[model samples]
Target: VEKVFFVTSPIYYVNAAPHIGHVYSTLITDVIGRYHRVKGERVFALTGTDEHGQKVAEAAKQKQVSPYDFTTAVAGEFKKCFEQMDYSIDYFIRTTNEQHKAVVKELWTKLEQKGDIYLGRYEGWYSISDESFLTPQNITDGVDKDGNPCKVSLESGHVVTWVSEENYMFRLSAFRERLLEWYHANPGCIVPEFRRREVIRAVEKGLPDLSVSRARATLHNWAIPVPGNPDHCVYVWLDALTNYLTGSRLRVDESGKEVSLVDDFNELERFPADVHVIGKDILKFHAIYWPAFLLSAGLPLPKKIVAHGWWTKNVFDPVEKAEEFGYDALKYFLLRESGFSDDGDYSDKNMIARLNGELADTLGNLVMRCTSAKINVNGEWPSPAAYTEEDESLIQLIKDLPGTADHYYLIPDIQKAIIAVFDVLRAINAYVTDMAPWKLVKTDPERLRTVLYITLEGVRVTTLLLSPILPRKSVVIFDMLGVPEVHRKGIENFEFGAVPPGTRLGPAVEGEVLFSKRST
Candidate 1:
């Protein structure tokens, strides 16, 4: 909104330690956030744990602890991984947080006063695992882990049970026309053509009034209390989706005063969101229900919601299970893999092969050879004195490298953005092979000096382009090349020579591998 560079990693519920899929969503945005910061934009990124819902209550009961304690521990588990993985989230929000509860209730009251919310009885098949209501079409026969018969949501493959309760409902049925108006008005609201098509079909079918609360007794007293009604607590979707508004700092006016629908609604984030990064399964909710809530409050809707596919079948359960791969190696692979919009498989073999074959043998080896080759007088970049046609072309490539990579980022999609870095790394590998600076050292000394400079500078630019995907590892290259950390300060239009000519470099890190190989 207004390009304050706002982004959210979909506040995930942490009933247990987060799965690799959760981090996939976070790291995608983390890559984008780093790029925005590089462009010198004031960026705010959000990710957090959703603490309420029937599942949280059930998990707490089995654990023999209060819901708060169970969720607190679970939320900690979610955040620690983001920290270890070096995510650039601005706030790790909790729906249970006072701030979130305040904002959600504020919107609830506005909708009530606006006549968009009503008290009613809700009857539907609900999936506790997914915390979503389902229609008859989605309910189906299924088996549990023990192979017993049960009903499940065909959409999620999770068990679903019939539920009936008196609750406050949002007048979502009344907004079908308005949503269609907005959809046609803003055709670019959803990313991926198929997703947009799918959403349009659902809206065309009309919407049902949403169940916005659960009976307090049934919810086990484990959720935000619905305003002025102790018998009911906010529904998980209402409670959870509002976190987006809270996460984006929407409830607060630009003046730092706490504001809501009735107060300072004028001060909310403007339309045309920078982006909303969500997992594909929840696409309908974000694309439909969430916008309905904001429209009810007269607030702006997100510019786009990119429902990216999840990691292949949750293959790496506790990501630490693959202790062999570095955090960023996995981070890079997820973003670099093809089918940014479709599902892809993840396995130890795939991780190992990509890491070793491309990351280690290609980019990592290039950096080590370029930095630690021991070619110059001290380890500084040599002047571009002797210019062969090959050196001249290498020089030109290094100069334009940042510009080439910047093209992908402008689309504002990390799936495309990270590929630009992958592209440059492959180019770097090819260029180094052509120049064969290792072979040049014996035959052409002066040209070797020039070639080494070109190689180091080329990797330097590539490292800058890739720092978003591989943050720490790239910084190591800059350090080894003796490029000043300050050179990284204003990287927006980083020129040809941030790794300036004659900048002293460190000695060749002999017998040391930058990206170590992994085993099964």
Candidate 2:
């Protein structure tokens, strides 16, 4: 069977404009999607707007527009921003798609048939902001609109209300033991295993049959209606999480016909996702609820769930200063600077330092000095001839890097994986200085040319390895190297002299600026 990858970002609710949090979740998935695709594997990368929610309806009303128009406009903004940032997302899913609604209803029916769903009376505090039912503990005493008495969601600071209604509920408590067993059996079921414990503890602590529908009178006409029982709207998370399976091109309709908004997903066995990149706020939904839904509906369990932390504060001071370092730079700093599993803070100063030192000074210099140098009389790669100990060490590092990086890259908690890539980058920078190819050019022309061959070849291999994270710049590196398709070599075979000697290269200026201006 072909290695298939299904990577997803949480479908963001379009109640507000897309912000840094949304960008962070989607960017990690985009990088991962690019990485696997570059390895010649089939990849499905999905990100999209969640258009249905009570809060969104209210927000739209305040603007004197219908919820649909409001969602459409905000979703457009999100799409435009991601494209401009070069997220390289494969599918844009919206919870409102008719095809999506059909599959969700079918999935819900299957779970109901499995006796995992039932009608029940629900009484609790509901958070319009969270699109979820909140416990008394989750709501704190707070002021509401007009400064009236109200409770607020501690997590989001949005108003919560007491409500009592007849609704459908998912029998989550029935699967508590099963969920604990699943996580225990699958050791790293959740990435950053620490969170796995958190998930397990939450489930082990206990679960109630969760409210899965809202009374039609309460939803502000914002969501998909319950199948047969059109008096209510299905839970938002129920349909939102299905976007992953929807993007996978799986699932069937009530009549067992193939159901997909796109094409048929090859190998129906590809139901289990390779990974889900999600924000920590909804860890339980993916970790506990999603699995139970899949289990009840007879779908395969997803391989892993990653609950990544968010930017606790603003990205930079003087927000306008962000223009200096753009999206790619932000993507780099986001993954490179923090532990992907831990909560992180974004600082403009840290970003500036990273760009100045880590990127511009190092990766930038490697591309510039190597491509800018003389390689041979024909201006092409030459066979590596004599080399000192430093040269051998450099070769060794390149050969072993992909495998070492693979360890974390597959775990794919972006930061640690990037740390692996930077390890090789640091070594290559050291190799460049240690070899001192600059002096060799005058004293020993032949050896210098041969050394240039090593540098260029080393860069060629390394650049392809970078196909995932630094895609655009990495391609620039390949174009300058004058190799036909450096990425085709894939990650498995990292030969020392893959780029044959005497292959012609374009002028060095073709890649003079890998990153923009670097300040001293």
Candidate 3:
């Protein structure tokens, strides 16, 4: 049987244009999916827009278009951005689709039958922008520049309005105790270690009533109508979370493919997600609300939810004063500076610093210099030589590099994993500097050849470890070292003797620097 991994990003709300935060989260999920594929796993990656809600409806109305048209336009934009960023998502799910609607309705019906859903009057402060109800305690007083009375939601910057209506409420309180029990029994269900602690601490305190479904009269009539009720629409969170199953084709699809949901569940047998990579802001939703919803639906909970930290920037601030400095800078900064669970400030200057200092200088320069040096020095790629004390030590370091990197990836920590790769590079660079092969080449040609052999072997190991992160550059390094193509195998499969001595190395293929400095 094939190993299957299902990964998803929280469907983005189209109320606002996509920003660095969206790109960061989506890129993290994309990298995870790519890593799985490189490991030879059958991976399904899903990302898309969360189209149904008061937020989208309001945004569409302001834009003078129907919600359907607005969401369609915005979804296309989202897809285009992902494509431009080179994200390899498998399915782009729009909650407005019929298949999604049907699946959501079915899940709602299942939960209703299980007595987890009930009809009730929901009276609370609601944030149309966030599509979530806010308690009086959650609302804070504020004033706009015009000095008008304004209510703000503590959770987000969305303006709040009083929402009191007859609506359906899921019995989340009923499952609160059970959820706490599950958390007690299952360690590491939620990630970042501290987040799990926060969840348990909050659950131990108590869970408030949750408004699961909304009334049609108060909000626009665009959402999937409540399973049995014609007037009400399913709440945004419930509707959005269903995409995880719907996009996986685990839910029944009639128009696209003739497959029964039952058959898919049985044959697929992959209901429990191996990982759910989410932003830290939505930790409560994925960790608490999502699993509770799944349990209420009589399905297994996701095995883990990895909560990544947020990326923010003060766009109005000066480039030097801004956190993360800029987007391109932020990309390399993320790869080099931070690890999973660690939060990094967003500023343009800092971003530029990271790109130039880390990616361009450390990683990209290392690859170019090594390959160029090999070509220049020997007029060809170098090969590995027999073991000596120095060669044996460097070879062991090379062989151990994959596992050291895998330790971080297996934990689903992107920051730690990528940092580990850089760490290995730093070690290898140190080894190269210490070997001083150029000095040996003038004095002892045979000893210099052995030193080059050791250096090439170190490059071979670096290429294998880095293949997951920088495939294109890794290929160049492998070719330059005259090693065979490194396949997607576990660390154990990495053999040291694979690069034979006296192997013919191909001429270097010049390409753009893998990364570059951002001009101020």
Candidate 4:
């Protein structure tokens, strides 16, 4: 049987356009998806806009359009951004889509039949800006830090509202203990390891009452109505979480067939998700609330919830700093410098430094030197040779890549992956210096050929391994080495000396430098 993988980025709130944080979460998943695809796994990657919240409805009103129309336009913008970024996403999910709504309703019906839902009132601090409820702890003394007096405005307020209405509530408390037990039993279920501890710690502290239904007065009538109650809509998180099931086609079809959106359900006997890449802000929703809901509904819990840290502009200087370094730089810098589990401040200088020092200077230069030597020495692509002691050592280093990379992705350990790449590049540079192929070119041409061939083979192997992270440029490296399809082959199929002997090589195409330093 072919192995299968399912990956999803948190459904982005549609009240705002795609931001740096949004792209970062999705980009990580996209990279993973590409890796799985190349590794011959049946991978499904899903990302889309969360289009049915009070904020979205209000934003639609401001734009003089219906919520659907407003979200449709904003969703288009997200699609364009993904396209520009060259993401190979499999599905673009929208909460308002017919298929999603159907799945949500079906899931609701299943839980309802299982007696996991009930009628109740939902009263809390709703933040329209966030399209989420502010916990009592999140609300300050009668107001938020914004200094605006807390009011019961559906769009913007921090004050708790005494909303009393007959609304549906999922029986989350019933499964709290089970969820806590699951967390204890499966420490690897949550990524970044620290967050798993956090989840356990929080669950140990006790789960707060989860309000899973909303009155028509509290939320807009645009949301999916309760199956039998026209006066209420399902809570945003409840509706939002269903997107995973809906996007995966795990929910029952109209004819009651168990069909997954990405693959046939019969093919995926296990319902546990491989990974859920979400923002750290909603850690509770995914880690605690959703798992509880799943347990109550007798559904399998997701295998892991990888809550990546947030990205915000450098707190010191806002405007001038943002302008000078560019957003992409800020993105690259935070990703390189920070641990995936820890929050990273976006800064111009930090981004530029990482790009210049790590990417351009270290990794990129290593590839250029190896391939350039091959072209110069052989006047073509040199055939890789059997292992000498040095070649054996280098090949061992190359073979260590997949497990090291899997460790990062499995734990969502971004910094470890970065460090691994840097170390590999450093080793390659040292190997080149020690081999001194330039010196060998005149004195010992045969040994030089072997050395160049080893270097080229190493470059080819490394380039394919790193393609998921640095796709566009990695593809260029593969094309430059004349093995563009190297990444598509399975691990067993990959060999060090795959390039034939005396293979004529193409001229080096001018590849773009991935990063450059900006004067601080």
Candidate 5:
């Protein structure tokens, strides 16, 4: 049976236009999905906007538009951004989708029937800005807009207000030990070990029975109604987190029937998501509360939660900037310039340096020189003549690439995986200098073809490894080498001789600027 890989990016709350930070989560998930597909797995990647919440309602009121209208516009912005950037998402889900609402209601009913939920009075500090209740420890001294004394969330700096009301509550405290056991049994369940440790410490402290519903009067009551109770709405976290399961349940079964986990959880072909890519700010909800909810509903928890850190810098116009820098450069610089799960600054200086130093100067230079008409007079992927120690050295490095890069991708150490590919890039460039294909053309014609073949094949294999990260450029580069569309599907295709002897190359080899250097 073909392995199934289900991955998700957190459903972004649709209160504003998506910034570069939001793209970071989806970009990681997109890369993971593409990498898995390239490994010959059946991949389903989901991303979308979280549309139902107090924030959405308030933002709509501010804009003097209906909440639905506001969410539609904002969600479209997100969709357009991802589409333009070429993020490969199988499903762009929306919390406002009718079927998604149905699934949310069904899961709430399941949990309620299981006795994990109870109607109770909740009195606590609530942050309308955050749309969640703040635990006592999470609140800190702060000033409001008027500079008055107030309690605010330490995490978001949002002001909190005291609220007391009747609501539905989840027995979260009862699962404290269960969560600890789950974390202990699966130490690597959360990436960046530090985040896992953070979850462990938080869960160890204690978990109060969570308020899972808001009163009708609260925040204008804009949310999914509690399963059978119209007097309250389900918590936004509960609604948003269920999008993952919603994506899973919406898959097709072997009999060619549309399966719904609500009808039967066993009917889900893609439940227990392989991974969820989320921002670090929401780690507690994803890592702790989400799993506890699934456990209560008797559903399997996602295999892993990848919480990545935020971007320290902002690009006012990501769409315009992506076009200006080229999506490949933006994607490459983001993954290459920083460690996965760590904060990174977006510096135009660094981006230009990387584009010029690596892509333009090294990778682009190598491809152009080898394929230049004078060096490759036959205009085909030349075949090697006789192997030498130096030739084998470069060839072996290319051969080992897929496995080496796969290791880092699985760890999802994206920066390292990129480094691994570029490491080969530098080696191939050095090999070209040593072999002097330019000089070999006149001094040793046959040797020139062999040297050029080794170099070209090295470029082909390395580009395949980097394909998930740089999809658009990789395809164009593949076109230049004359690789067929069918041959680029999986890692197996990365084997030697893909572009074998005497295969006529495409026109891109003649003059296409595969990677252009930007102005400093």
Candidate 6:
């Protein structure tokens, strides 16, 4: 279909300021987006805020502001977090956007027309924080801030309250078998085998009809009102899921409204997203209801849903930490330290070790040694006259890197991708020592050029592969290697000898390092 490599991070809820949890989802999605871009595909990555919900409304009340004002402020904070780190996001969609509301209402009308939606009385345990309705099995006894008893969501530990109201319901039950069949046909559609199994088990247990709208009055009138019903508002998840579709950049008519796709099918493209990266907490929504909604709308579902685990650590000053540690260091440490789909901890000690030990001591020293003034006296990237077993060994590893790392990238195991590049870097570091380019300059000048040139090639390829994870630093490294901007992209360019012999090279200042030391 020639669709763009569309990827998305779950639109965040703006009830509270964003934390590392939200940043992690956005960061991982950014890595995927950048990888596809480097592969030379048209990529569109979408991320933003989920602004219309009871959680937001209650938070606004507590903050003594209107929902609009509160969401605006918090949404800005989220945007700033990604911006400061230079995330490669194409669009930041707000659920409160007028265009988004229009699409949500349109989807509701279509579902109602298809008889997939019907009026029903909803009575259940609703968690305002989770923005979900829960059954008895999903709740547990808990204590409130005052130490009184309350029923809380077992998954999130958020308080849940009994609510009974007349609302519009979607017939999720009708799609249970269809969803199961999808699981059977496309086993890889949901990542993290355990998460896919969990969804299957829940669907097999039963697919309850989902309340698609809430009473407008009960919701503080903070959400999109149903297409024809002023008394009810579209459920937050329904509103949030539409953000992915919104990135299709739906065409608008002269009157400044969406051109009718029903009348003309050409108006919508980029419908089926390539990937949706989300947290484990909302796996059910993305895995189950999101697809069900798309099926009901006669729309193509996203290619895959990747559910990643949560961060257990906290930073009292995240902005300060980001500034102190640097963006690439934080990005590399978080991704490299955690398995893509497993829980992990974040600590200053761990981050500093990775920074100094891996980045500074290993990767940094490799480049510094290769470009040092003591060697390469000609100040040019010396053409290799011949290859030795040690030199070919490093080149072979570089040759195999793209495929090996791509395997992990397809699995979306970004941790392994980071490791794959560094594994080669470590190998290159050892190759330099074993070959002893420093001594070869005196004992064997001809052999020294070949060794140093090979080491330089090693640095160039590893830096090329890491462009997605370490965007800014890779550029600086490329400049240091005298690599032109034109050849900085694409897997094909990660070849040996791409940097011609006799090409002018950047000087290596004595004692200079690529990554900086961070304070504990």
- Per-residue lDDT of candidate 4, residues 265-332 (tens digit): 44444245578888777787899888877776677788888877663102333223334544344434
How many Å off is the CA of 115 in candidate 3?
1.4
RMSD of each: 3.8, 3.8, 4.0, 4.8, 2.8, 3.0
Model 5 spans with C-alpha error above 4 angstroms: 251-262, 265-268, 311-315, 508-511
Tens digit per residue, CA lDDT, model 6, 211-284: 99998888899999888789899999999988877756645445334443332223444567778999888888
33, model 3: CA deviation in Å?
A: 1.2
**Which tens-of-lDDT digit does each residue in 187-292 have in candidate 2?**
8779878788888787877898888898876879788998888889988889888877776764445543335554444454345678888888888889988999
Model 3 RMSD vs true structure: 4.0
TM-score pick, better of 2 and 6: 6
Q: 328-353, model 3: which lDDT tens digit per residue?
A: 33444555555544456545576666
TM-score to native of every candidate shown: 0.89, 0.91, 0.88, 0.86, 0.94, 0.94
Model 2, runs deviating above 4 Å:
1-3, 145-149, 250-270, 311-323, 341-345, 374-378, 486-489, 518-520
Q: What does the lDDT come to for candidate 3?
A: 0.70
Least well predicted 10-residue stretch by lDDT in candidate 1: 262-271
Residue-by-residue lDDT tens digits, candidate 1, 131-206:
8889998889999988999998888898988999987889999999988998889887787667888999999987
What TM-score, to 2 decimals, does candidate 4 have? 0.86
- Candidate numbers sorted by TM-score from highest down: 6, 5, 2, 1, 3, 4
Model 6, CA-based lDDT = 0.84
lDDT at position 197, candidate 2: 81
